[PDB]
Amino acid sequence: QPGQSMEIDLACNGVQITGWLPQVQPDGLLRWRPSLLSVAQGMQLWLEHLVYCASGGNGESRL
Amino acid sequence: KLQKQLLEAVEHKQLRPLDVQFALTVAGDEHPAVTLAAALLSHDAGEGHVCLPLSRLENNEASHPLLATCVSEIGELQNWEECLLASQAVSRGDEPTPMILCGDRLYLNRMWCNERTVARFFNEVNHAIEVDEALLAQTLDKLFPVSDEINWQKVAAAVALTRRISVISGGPGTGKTTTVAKLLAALIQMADGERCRIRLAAPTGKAAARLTESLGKALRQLPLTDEQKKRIPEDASTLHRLLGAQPGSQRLRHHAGNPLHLDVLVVDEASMIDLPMMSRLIDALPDHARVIFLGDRDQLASVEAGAVLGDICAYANAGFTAERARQLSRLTGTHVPAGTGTEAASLRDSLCLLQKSGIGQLAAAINRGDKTAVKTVFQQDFTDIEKRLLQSGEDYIAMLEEALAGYGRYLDLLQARAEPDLIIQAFNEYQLLCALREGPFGVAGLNERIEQFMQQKRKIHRWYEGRPVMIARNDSALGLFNGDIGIALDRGQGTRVWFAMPDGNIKSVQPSRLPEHETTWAMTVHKSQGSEFDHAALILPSQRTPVVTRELVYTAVTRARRRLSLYADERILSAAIATRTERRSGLAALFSS
């Protein structure tokens, strides 16, 4: 679904996290890469999904 | 064909090997008119010129006499538009073609996309930001005490706040930095709960540290709470570091995909922003970000080939639109003048010129006739301005004699065996500025005569002990950039050149470790922009050449903090004041559309 990039500011353990998550649709996070399934790609989506669920963002994340 | 004819231009040094090979590959076997037209286009693009209008290429009055070999080829068809567009090497912009011919100006697709991106961003995509006029007026009233007369600084703050993209134009010492502090203070005070992210940027790290200290002194003159002082920007970085320019490659970490994360951005000394960097900065900006540019219209970097700000402020002389003059009257609480006629609405409303500042009276008389110029340098002497008539060589030696007087304090500190840090600050007390690069008057001319005057007089014997040196090209490894100065002396560990880091720490560099260095006793007026000099001297040739221009002499006078001296002919200097730098860029032609 069409979506816009959002900016993230969070407080975790008194540490501020700043960054951008591109192409955030109202359903959730959607990423696609042309490679083999690996745990490095799952860990990459994991950190991106946790920072997505910490600020609003009700929904799933798929890769 | 014309190929072998173009091979002579390399020996004649009228064309670089890049221009000739680009002309053989792209134009190919087509008419020799198309081959040399891409040759002079690649040459002017190499020197920094944006485009190549067809009228300049046709007239025999143009340079590169290899052009006279065109009459034997083009056969005087008198149509450059019909010949060039017919070939596949030139198109109207529809096809993916290297060269583009549109408004009679021929130039590369690179310059075409950069001209289109810049001229559109100022004409389009910008939105008028509507805020409460009563509250915005109450804020500006508390910043500026005097409401009795029209304040140019009050209009500059109102225009920048009401418009997303804006430019504040003004000369050195006119209070530009103070107006920015009033703009940033009124910006943070406007939105209490909304996020305010401010960034300071400069093309050079030199003027960047000049921006941080000057903005710091001006901001502490105004009261703010702890939340406002928390949103105060920290420091400024180089525009290349802001965009994340890699030293090895040309790629940028931001570009179109990753926008800069910001609210407002202030770019100081926008005169050194060439068209490539302005076009690369526009695509990096998000849609919610307001950008403010700082600089002057008459600075030589604005009128130089490839510059943007020069043609932007050229329309500022017309004035504000009739409607904005009524809107700014309700904001500033004064009567704002309205410009006559309607040329470009979005561009004229986004510009502001600060006319309030011997240096100021002379520079203001430069734009006027020579009658006010000769009268200002003459009577009352202003104590900041002196004039020496230079014709015969006997006055040329006395020029070098007073040149030693300006370096008199500097030359002694070299021979007094001081520390490098104080001497770095000492070399900023005097500098020499010359129009031409070569000849009896010029960079190549003075450096030989000046160092010869250092042999005749025993002040310093000749890397020689106590020599000042400037860096010719940027270096990412050593942390030193073009336009920076250094002092070479023996601390007892060895002969090493020392530099002053923005953090205040001294950094020793071996003489063989510098990427590029040259004798800095005389500087090119373009290379000294952004630097400050307590005393300055201008060297102009007795010859009449178009190289000497108005914006060159302007940047020479504005390059001096307080003291200034001049050696020039009243006939040569005043006539050069009338002559102004000609810009070929098609930006001002698109604003008229």
Side-chain angles (χ1 to χ4, degrees), chain B residues 182-198:
Chain B
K182 303 293 175 58
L183 176 63
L184 296 181
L187 198 143
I188 307 176
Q189 291 180 347
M190 182 57 188
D192 303 329
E194 299 184 3
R195 54 169 65 181
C196 300
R197 297 174 295 172
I198 309 181

Side-chain angles (χ1 to χ4, degrees), chain B residues 83-94:
Chain B
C83 181
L84 293 181
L85 187 58
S87 178
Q88 293 178 315
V90 181
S91 180
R92 298 290 298 181
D94 175 270

Side-chain angles (χ1 to χ4, degrees), chain B residues 48-53 105 107 111 115 275 302-312 315 582-591:
Chain B
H49 286 74
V50 175
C51 87
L52 179 56
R105 297 171 308 273
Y107 50 100
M111 301 300 180
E115 283 194 325
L275 183 73
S302 291
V303 299
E304 194 56 37
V308 168
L309 189 55
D311 304 334
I312 305 301
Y315 288 95
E582 301 176 351
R583 55 263 191 272
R584 301 178 183 180
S585 300
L587 292 176
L590 191 50
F591 292 128

Side-chain angles (χ1 to χ4, degrees), chain B residues 69-82:
Chain B
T69 60
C70 295
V71 191
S72 59
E73 308 292 338
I74 84 187
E76 298 180 354
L77 292 178
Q78 293 182 341
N79 297 332
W80 283 95
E81 176 184 356
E82 172 67 25

Side-chain angles (χ1 to χ4, degrees), chain B residues 410 413-415 417-421 423-424 427 460-461 463-471 485-492 494-500 507-512 514 517-518 520-521:
Chain B
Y410 176 66
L413 290 175
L414 303 167
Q415 209 166 3
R417 207 56 174 185
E419 64 276 7
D421 185 30
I423 302 186
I424 290 182
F427 184 73
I460 300 178
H461 167 268
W463 298 93
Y464 49 105
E465 190 176 339
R467 66 164 310 175
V469 283
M470 65 170 301
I471 312 298
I485 55 188
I487 273 78
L489 47 74
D490 179 27
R491 186 52 186 86
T495 303
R496 302 165 72 92
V497 61
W498 295 77
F499 293 92
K507 191 171 181 177
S508 57
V509 178
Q510 295 184 347
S512 299
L514 286 187
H517 69 272
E518 194 173 24
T520 169
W521 290 95

